[PDB]
Amino acid sequence: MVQSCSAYGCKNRYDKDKPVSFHKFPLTRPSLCKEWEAAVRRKNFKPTKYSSICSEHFTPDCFKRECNNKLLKENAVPTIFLELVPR
Numbered sequence: 001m002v003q004s005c006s007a008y009g010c011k012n013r014y015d016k017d018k019p020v021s022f023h024k025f026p027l028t029r030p031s032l033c034k035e036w037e038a039a040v041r042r043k044n045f046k047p048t049k050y051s052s053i054c055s056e057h058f059t060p061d062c063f064k065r066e067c068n069n070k071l072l073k074e075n076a077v078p079t080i081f082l083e084l085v086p087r
């Protein structure tokens with residue numbers, strides 16, 4: 001537990017061992033960004049400290065980029081909270 005994320009009551013942990021990464025709510029990805037909202041599903045993901053997501057929810061394939069701490073290409077999505085379902 002060396003870093004928080006948006007995911008309500010998440011079990012993330014920025015440890016030297018745990019290869020978990022963290023990202024901040026992006027602006028380059030807007031429409032798709034709506035998807036990120038699902039990543040939260042909370043009252044209203046306030047960009048104050050919640051404007052960020054952890055890898056634990058993202059798909060391994062979404063980490064194709066070997067950047068410093070910015071891995072969430074157009075593909076990026078918090079699948080784990082994929083609300084998109086047969087309404």
Ligand SMILES: [Zn+2]
Nearest residue numbers: 005007010054
């Ligand atoms: Zn998380």
